[PDB]
Amino acid sequence: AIAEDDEERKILEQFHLQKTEITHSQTLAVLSQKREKLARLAAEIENN
Amino acid sequence: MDLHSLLELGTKPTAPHVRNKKVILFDTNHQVSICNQIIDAINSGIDLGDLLEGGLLTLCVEHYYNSDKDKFNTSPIAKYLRDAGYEFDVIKNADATRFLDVIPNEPHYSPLILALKTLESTESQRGRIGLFLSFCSLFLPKLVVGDRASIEKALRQVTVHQEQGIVTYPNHWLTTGHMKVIFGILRSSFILKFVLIYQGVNLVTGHDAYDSIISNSVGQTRFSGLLIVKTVLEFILQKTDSGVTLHPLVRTSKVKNEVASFKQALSNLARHGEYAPFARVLNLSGINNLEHGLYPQLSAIALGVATAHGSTLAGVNVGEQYQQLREAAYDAEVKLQRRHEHQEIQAIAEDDEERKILEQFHLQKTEITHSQTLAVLSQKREKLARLAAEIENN
Amino acid sequence: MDLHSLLELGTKPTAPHVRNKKVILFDTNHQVSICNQIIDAINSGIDLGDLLEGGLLTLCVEHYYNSDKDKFNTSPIAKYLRDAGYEFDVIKNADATRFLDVIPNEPHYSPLILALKTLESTESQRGRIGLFLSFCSLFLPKLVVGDRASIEKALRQVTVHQEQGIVTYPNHWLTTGHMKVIFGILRSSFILKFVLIYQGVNLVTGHDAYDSIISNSVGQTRFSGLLIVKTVLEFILQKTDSGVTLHPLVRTSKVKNEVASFKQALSNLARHGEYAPFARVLNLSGINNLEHGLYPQLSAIALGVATAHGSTLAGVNVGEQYQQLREAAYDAEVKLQRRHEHQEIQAIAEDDEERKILEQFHLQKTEITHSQTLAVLSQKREKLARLAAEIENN
RNA sequence: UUUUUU
RNA sequence: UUUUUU
RNA sequence: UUUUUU
RNA sequence: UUUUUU
């Protein structure tokens, strides 16, 4: 909807696909450190 | 109700499923040395059977993305391999010298680490990884045929690329046991094939010798096991300015059902997008509905008409139940194309002297084409005789 | 849907990728001495295998941009080489005397520095760097053919340029082992070729002898491996004031598909702009879709018609499957052009005495052309016989 | 009961 | 199952 | 793969 | 590569 040419929509398409891949890799990083934080708290609860 | 919709059930997926595949990306500081030891362990014949996708992805990330892993993680290669089910976990080892130090502590990795203890690696440069991926790209045209055709096309491309002088491969790479090993490596691994197909299409600017070799061999891989698509779309479904028109050999009422089902299973192939040329080599979804046995008469008539235009298509093999209809369609198309070129010569010639010049030229052209077709048929006959001689040798 | 769009997938890149190439620009105060020792290390046969692009770029920046590196950094050479993936880092050494002092401390540079310890360099002037780049420019026409054709055209241009007396090369440069070395240097290095192509096009005013030699040899490099482009655009796709018109030998219904695909792959070549003549020598993008095997009949008919106009094109070699259609198209075009020049002589002559003068002239002109075509065919036949004699010598 | 081919 | 050529 | 001439 | 005469 918001482009004007095919060259403009090629630049905006390449930007928004890279932006979505950035947020998906950040979401997976947050999920992995959440899982390790829960595992470390459970290891401390088992230790204590 | 529409009872002819029963034939289309169970075809297309209604709740699509993917299976997770955990693939191990290695990340050291001595990354070129780790990748050269992965190259040396592949060349030695050592079966690294679960770490094969991880070692090949380490080679491909270190060549194309400079082992950065954040440039790789947001690339469309990694989006495609995530949608195809792979999960990348990057294990890290800041002081790792050898490939022996990097293998995990699973008990089935014990024959791999005792094989890697005695393996001697040669010190080598940055330019061995691109050499190895360029050698693996040569097997990609005629990959889906078999091992003999891949090794023959690979050695022909070794001689073509060394005749330009731009590369040299070592002589133990060109032994047929080693080429058999590299064929099995490329055949059993999905992500090496996809990375070579993607970077052959898309890495186009500022070429190395190796990247031009990979793009040249990926440009010959287009419709590698999809000959029926090229023959039907080029000759049966005729493209003109009015529209699509059928060939006169297929306009009767018994082959029109096969061209309707071919049009449907053809339009489900372009759902794959820009990898729809590469559908049999990557083993994509709709390629079971493009087999020759599903369309026997359409494949034989299309191969006959395509042989009657391009003279080098007489060396394809086909099954025994398709050869004779192929020869009949070839002879009918030779007579039909001769009548058409005679009528067009009568159309475009403005005087009888020019008309005699053009009739002698186009007559001599068809005689040249017919002699080339008999020469390539005799090449096929002693090629199959040499194959059966090798069968009776063992 | 349009099912004939399946044949165009996987062709053009949809997410274009470049690979970074780190190239080392040397910056001392004794820059002419460093560049003359790089020239002497190249001439000695010493393989400086990773510092080759850096040494050649040091030579080219010191010749054309006076080793300024801020005039170079904002030039269109550096914009082009940045878009093609190269990254320049300028290492600095304010008191560096020899090329031995400037090499980094990587461990694979040890055979280079032990080779450079025993290398004797001769003291020489500013005019050796332009002499070396002018000698490297002589291999650029017929670079893409092979080493024998490059060395033969290079020695022919040595004799032409010394017959004007403007240069002299030393006699150990003209030994064929040394010319083989300089061929491999120019073939393996992208940026020396591009710098010579750019400065042959664009450095045009206030000429030295060396810069006129480089511009002369770059003006012969235009369409060096693109003969099919010159033959089709000059003779098949005929230019006139009404438009583009096909030749009468290609207006039938079996070659018009090949001229349509040639028009498409041709218009993707002019996407490269002003280096589209230099597309095979620089190894640019769309040159795999301009091969002779993709268009067999169009290449043979175009080479036949071009041989029938220009008499010196009978010495091109071609494959065995294209020679006979080429000879048929040559004979048809000789008869067609004879009929056209007879009708134009009848058009432009205002009296029969003038018409007899013009008919005798144009008859004698075609007899002269036919004798020259047989002379160059016999030159090709003993040239291939001398080549096969050299094959059986080893 | 089902029956081929791919 | 795939089968040529470049 | 490329193939002449200038 | 250039090729005469003045």
Residue numbers in the entry:
A (entry chain A): 347 to 394
B (entry chain B), C (entry chain B): 1 to 394
Provide text from the study.
The nucleoprotein (NP) of Marburg virus (MARV), a close relative of Ebola virus (EBOV), encapsidates the single-stranded, negative-sense viral genomic RNA (vRNA) to form the helical NP–RNA complex. The NP–RNA complex constitutes the core structure for the assembly of the nucleocapsid that is responsible for viral RNA synthesis. These two lobes are connected by a flexible hinge region and are considered to clamp the RNA strand between the two lobes by electrostatic interactions.
Here, we show the structure of the MARV NP–RNA complex determined using cryo-electron microscopy at a resolution of 3.1 Å. The constituted complex shows a left-handed double-helical structure, in which respective strands have similar dimensions: each strand contains single-strand RNA, and 30.50 NP subunits per turn and a 128.99 Å helical pitch (rise = 4.23 Å, rotation = 11.8052°) with the outer and inner diameters of ~330 Å and 255 Å, respectively. The respective asymmetric NP subunits, NP-a and NP-b, show very similar conformations as shown by a 0.592 Å backbone Root Mean Square Deviation (RMSD). In the positively charged cleft between the N- and C-terminal lobes, six RNA nucleotides are encapsidated with a “3-bases-inward, 3-bases-outward” configuration. In particular, the interactions between NP and RNA are predominantly electrostatic due to positively charged residues such as K142, K153, R156, and H292 with their side chains pointing to the phosphate backbone of the RNA. The N-terminal arm (residues 1 to 19) protrudes sideway from the N-terminal lobe and has a short 310-helix η1, which is associated with a neighboring NP molecule within the helical complex. Similar to EBOV NP, the N-terminal arm of MARV NPn occupies a hydrophobic pocket located on the C-terminal lobe of NPn+1 via L6 and L9. The structures of the asymmetric unit, a complex of an NP and six RNA nucleotides, was very similar to that of EBOV, suggesting that both viruses share common mechanisms for the nucleocapsid formation.
